[PDB]
Amino acid sequence: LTADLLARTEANKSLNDQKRAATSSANFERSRLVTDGFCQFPQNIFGCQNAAEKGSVKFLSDDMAIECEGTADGKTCSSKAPGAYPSFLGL
């Protein structure tokens, strides 16, 4: 197993680096969504995480998009489950 897993680590390394950069950028931008003007007063009435999950966010949503991009087939993605009840209060 470890042989093929290392082989596809080598074959997918660039995409996972992009994934890690995107999630880190999302996590950092999560402190600047009002200063930069992404989840302002209207859009963040509910959870701005829910805004990123459902609506549109410059960085958070990006991660939401690539987080499950190009993952292993057959297995549920390491970054997110197939489904889940909504985050507690969009938190």
Partner 1 sequence: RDVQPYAGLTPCKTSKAFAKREKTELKALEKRLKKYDPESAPALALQATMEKTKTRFANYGESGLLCGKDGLPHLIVDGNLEHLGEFAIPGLGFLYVAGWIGYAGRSYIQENKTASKPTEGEIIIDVPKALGLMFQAGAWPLLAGLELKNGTLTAPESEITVSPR
Partner 2 sequence: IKTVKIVVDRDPVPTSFEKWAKPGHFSRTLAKGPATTTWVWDLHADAHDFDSHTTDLEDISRKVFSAHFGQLGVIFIWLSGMYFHGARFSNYEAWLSDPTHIKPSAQVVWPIVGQEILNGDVGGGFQGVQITSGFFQLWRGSGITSELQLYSTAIGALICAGLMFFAGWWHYHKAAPKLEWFQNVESMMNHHLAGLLGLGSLAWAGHQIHIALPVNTLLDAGVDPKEIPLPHEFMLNRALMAELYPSFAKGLTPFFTFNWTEYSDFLTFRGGLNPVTGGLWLTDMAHHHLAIAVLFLVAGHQYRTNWGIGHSMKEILEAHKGPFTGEGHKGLYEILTTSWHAQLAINLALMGSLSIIVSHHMYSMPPYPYLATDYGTQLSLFTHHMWIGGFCICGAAAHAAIFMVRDYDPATNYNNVLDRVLRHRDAIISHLNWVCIFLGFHSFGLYIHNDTMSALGRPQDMFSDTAIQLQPIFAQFVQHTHALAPELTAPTAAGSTSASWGGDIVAVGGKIAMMPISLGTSDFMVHHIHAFTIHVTVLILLKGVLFARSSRLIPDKANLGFRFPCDGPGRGGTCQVSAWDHVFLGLFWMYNSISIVIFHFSWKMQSDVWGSVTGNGVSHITGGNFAQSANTINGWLRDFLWAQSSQVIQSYGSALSAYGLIFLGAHFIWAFSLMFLFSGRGYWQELIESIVWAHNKLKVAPAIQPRALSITQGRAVGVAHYLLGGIATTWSFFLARIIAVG
Query: Binding site: residue ranges?
Result: 45
Q: Does 40 bind partner 2 (CB under 8 A)?
A: no
Q: What DSSP character marks residue 36?
A: T
Q: Would you say 43 or 79 has its CB closer to partner 2? A: 79
Measured in residues, the chain has a length of 91
Q: Does 25 bind partner 1 (CB under 8 A)?
A: yes
**What spatial distance separates the first Cα and last Cα of the chain, rounded to whole Å?**
36
Q: Which does 48 bind (CB under 5 to 8 A by kind): partner 2, partner 1, ligand CLA, none?
A: none
Q: Would you say 2 or 31 has its CB closer to ligand CLA? A: 31
Buried b (16+ CB within 10 A) or exposed e, 33-48: beeeebbeeebbeebb
Q: Does 36 bind partner 1 (CB under 8 A)?
A: yes
Cβ partners under 8 Å of residue 56, min gap 6: none
Q: How near is the Cβ of 33 to ligand CLA at its closest, in Å? A: 9
Q: Residues interacting with ligand CLA, by CB under 6 A?
A: 31, 91
